[PDB]
Design a protein around this nucleic acid. Structure first.
Lengths: 109, 73, 81, 74, 93, 95, 93, 109, 94, 82
DNA sequence: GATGTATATATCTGACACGTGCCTGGAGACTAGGGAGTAATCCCCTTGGCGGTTAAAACGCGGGGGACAGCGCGTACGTGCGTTTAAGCGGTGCTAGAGCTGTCTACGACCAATTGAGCGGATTTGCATAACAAAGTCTCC
DNA sequence: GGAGACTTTGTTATGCAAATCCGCTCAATTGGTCGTAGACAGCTCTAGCACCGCTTAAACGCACGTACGCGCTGTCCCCCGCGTTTTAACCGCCAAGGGGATTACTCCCTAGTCTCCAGGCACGTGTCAGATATATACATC
């Protein structure tokens, strides 16, 4: 894995930015199972972090294309719809104030 | 004395402005220069509000030493 | 209240249609579109009201709307949830 | 009291006057688009004399009007 | 009165990905809904797998299977690699 | 001076595709929501956020419907959308 | 190896509605998938309602709300009326 | 209903479906930490109602086809020719169910 | 000889009434195994697993053909073409 | 090793399915398009059925793995368990 | 008149409906401990109204572009017919692997004490925008 | 006869919302004990694979003819775009008060344990409703 971690929290040991202890609590709470294994919140926090990073990266690139330094709902919508895997994962999601993509059928020109 | 402080800060900001203009520098340059000298970079919005004294007394006092250095350099 | 369905005016219908890429709209679209909107709203509102009532509240909140939409396969992001 | 010229402005009225003389009765929106593009394509060295003139004009403006405050309004 | 969210962690990730880009509050509201929705789907499927196989415990294996079932293509593959690595580092000395 | 028909429609399509604001005016939308709600139960109140959530969802729905409606019209070799293109899109879709 | 199904109960209902009609084993296999599917959906929604309102108990009220959200038209009304009677009678018996 | 005289819970509730089983299935399965006393009674009554409704319709289909027995096909006809059940079961595939005899008019001579 | 369309209408009634599988069983199994082999080698199937896959596949294709037929009618045709299949899938969201 | 069993879905298999669906006439290119569609449907269902099978550490795909694979896609199947 | 489908008989078969005896999950009666319900308090956000500005909707008109109906080719589909292939059935046999039980240990729940990461509420600070220098050409009040 | 619009870049000021800081709380982290869920080994014996040979129903190829798809023309409806009139949305501000959230008590309901025993299930009998085959007549093309 990554070379090291010494700090006390679980997120630090796992090399993550996302919380681990919180994830564990949320898994214990709403009746998903009677028991939650030690690696369950670690593995899951890493996955959520990965997916979070991809959307933000793509949205940030959209912001630069519009010559802005900020992510707004529109940039998130473009980031998702111009990426096939995210588009499938989030295919049914309505993003408030996200707008639409500029698709004009050629037959109308 | 808050009035004595106000006068000192008004005088400082006025000297800062006069040197900035005389020497041909912009508010953007004061900002960037401070970043290089101190690690704390300021935008021209901050410099404008400082010169216009639209900032709190504490901010002006805290920023002043950095600006004093800017004038000297 | 009565007849507020007419508050969805022709230009509203057209602007939505344009966003969707429609170049020409026949004259009967306006009525058909209103019928569709109304059905969508009744189904979403009815469920939001049902959640509101279950909880014994009198005010429909954003979350009751969000759950009502989630159940129809229309997950909405940005209003809580 | 009017504002001092910046480096673009010192350069552009020099070049705008040239453009107007070479091509009189040319609309300034054409001249301005061309001047904008040329300025963007200039090096720091090429801009430098206008930068130095702009610096001098700003200092002179302040000395002429030490109490000038730019007050734009909506 | 206290309400939790992932706003702080989302910000922290944005910093590493794009050091000079900020995020609006509305965009952040969307990112929080995104994280909560993915969390529930994965946790939901992992729960079902444990039930199907007659287990009472959710482990990293169910989470991994749930990830493969829910995420498409290469998105799933890279997610699996990151999860595997985090667990390995976590349990290692 | 005049523009030939369709010139403006294309400008509008680009304009609306670029912007993000809501297209249905808010007060009449809000009254429609209340009218419907009264039939289910009287004396309900709504948070302003509930109304906004409904409106955002409604437009997203109608916009998506128009995109599919438009495809049906193209399939039929038309530019103009008709009630039956809406009905076909809904039926195939499963509503 | 022991399994449970509702074939006894399905059969008993059939004889009340149609005393002279039998049912094939494949038809019975379908009726068991049906009962299990409806059970899960109602129980699933009732679980969610309890969670949403921050409760840990499923009562007849959640089951009733879940029925209204899941069944269309008049099935919801008749199902609610029948559920109400069963609870009423049970309580008093 | 007027009365019951038995030791079971299904009898008290006037039901044919088991009550104790429903309670057991609600407790197991992680639906909640707790299951109320009326929850399996109310639920058993609902399952019974829906079961009875399908069988009655399927039985009528069997008689229309001049049969004494219900087979998967009759269950499919019973559902598809009834709007409320069709919505409830709109996505369900029935093994050996068959289809309704729908022919478009434009295909006819 | 019968005119074109007499037989097709006959067959439509016949197939709508019956319930049997239309795809031959052994060819279907080989297809299932071929696909499964690409995902993982040495898998076995229960005979009931294959029947479940086959019932689902036919139900899927039959439903697709019903929507395909509507599209062809909308376009004022009798004959179904690849574009009607594609339109139906697109509207559905595949 | 198996290959080319997609052709096991013969023209009459396709025609019969189309007729059950009410299709009166079939274009000559339908046959190929239909095969492409069937194959995609099967790959997605099989892939999930295999995933459940591996999770459980079995080598035999059962009816239940197929049923969950289908349930998951919104296609509940009745009669093979559920 | 020719080609298909439903209906009047006789026989038997796989499939169902019934009855024993053996558990093993369902029901009854106690107890304890938390959860949900009640009443009383605060105060945040909702409804409702008011007048004024003006941006969007409604209306009419005329003109062009597109929906629609009708016609005529030509080829791509259906429908028969005879030959060929591979499915389906039954039979024999082998063995991998599902499904169960029984020991035993590492794993996670639970508790109680401790402590730093994260929460709200202030307070600093940057983005995003827009006004104006010069100058000549053209438009409208 | 005079103002202002129009264009370019770069430096200044300005509204609002986002990034950063403080102090305190309380959810996350140690560390230890307990009990049981699940890992592992070994056994039975189900049911899934593989092959062979025969019948025979379905698939395959090819010839023929015509019903349908496609392109073209021409007519008339009806939707677009413009400019003018009118209408109701939107903006601020204000007051009134109803319902949502919080807190602190109280009592009832459900989990858990233990006991008892009859309703439900594998397994073996016993009877028949509709398929399979023949022969008659009418429905549809």
């Amino acid at each position: 894995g990554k070379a090291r971690a010494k700090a006390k929290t679980r997120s630090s040991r796992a090399g993550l930015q996302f919380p681990v202890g919180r994830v564990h609590r949320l898994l214990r709470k709403g009746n998903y199972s009677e028991r939650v294994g030690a690696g369950a919140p670690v593995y899951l926090a890493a996955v959520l972090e990965y997916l979070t990073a991809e959307i933000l990266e793509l949205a940030g690139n959209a912001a630069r294309d519009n010559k802005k330094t900020r992510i707004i709902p529109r940039h998130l919508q473009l980031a998702i719809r111009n990426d096939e895997e995210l588009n499938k994962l989030l295919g049914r999601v309505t993003i408030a104030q996200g707008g639409v993509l500029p698709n004009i059928q050629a037959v109308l020109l | 004395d808050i009035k004595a402080l106000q006068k000192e800060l008004e005088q400082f900001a006025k000297l800062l402005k006069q040197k900035r203009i005389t020497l041909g520098y912009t508010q953007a340059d004061v900002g960037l220069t401070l970043g290089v000298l101190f690690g704390k970079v300021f935008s021209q919005t901050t410099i404008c509000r400082f010169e216009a004294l639209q900032l709190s007394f504490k901010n002006m006092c805290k920023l002043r030493p950095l600006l004093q250095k800017w004038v000297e350099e | 209240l009565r007849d507020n369905i007419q508050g969805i005016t022709k230009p509203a219908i057209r602007r939505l249609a344009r966003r969707g890429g429609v170049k020409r709209i026949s004259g009967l679209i306006y009525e058909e579109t209103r019928g569709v909107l109304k059905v969508f709203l009744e189904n979403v509102i009815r469920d939001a009201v049902t959640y509101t009532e279950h909880a014994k509240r009198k005010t429909v909140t954003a979350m009751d709307v969000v759950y009502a939409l989630k159940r129809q396969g229309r997950t909405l992001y940005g209003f809580g949830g | 009291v009017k504002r001092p010229m910046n480096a673009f402005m010192v350069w552009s009225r020099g070049q705008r006057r040239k453009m107007a003389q070479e091509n009189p009765k040319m609309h300034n929106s054409e001249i301005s688009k061309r001047l904008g593009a040329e300025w963007k394509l200039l090096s720091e060295t090429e801009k430098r004399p206008f930068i130095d003139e702009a610096k001098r004009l700003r200092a002179l403006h302040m000395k002429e009007h030490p109490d000038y405050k730019y007050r734009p309004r909506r | 009165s206290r309400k939790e969210s992932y706003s702080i962690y989302v910000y922290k990730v944005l910093k590493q990905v794009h050091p000079d880009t900020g995020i609006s509050s509305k965009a952040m509201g969307i990112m929080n809904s995104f994280v909560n929705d993915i969390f529930e789907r994965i946790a939901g499927e992992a729960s079902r797998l444990a039930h199907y196989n007659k287990r009472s415990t959710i482990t990293s294996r169910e989470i991994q299977t749930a990830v493969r079932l829910l995420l498409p293509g290469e998105l799933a593959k890279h997610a699996v690699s990151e999860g595997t690595k985090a667990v390995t580092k976590y349990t290692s000395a | 001076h005049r523009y030939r028909p369709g010139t403006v429609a294309l400008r509008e399509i680009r304009r609306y595709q670029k912007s993000t604001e809501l297209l249905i005016r808010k007060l009449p939308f809000q009254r429609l929501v209340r009218e419907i709600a009264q039939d289910f139960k009287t004396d309900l109140r709504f948070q302003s956020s509930a109304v906004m959530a409904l409106q955002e969802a409604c437009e997203a729905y109608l916009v998506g419907l128009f995109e599919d409606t438009n495809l049906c019209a193209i399939h039929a070799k038309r530019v103009t959308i008709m009630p039956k293109d809406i009905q076909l899109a809904r039926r195939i879709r499963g509503e």
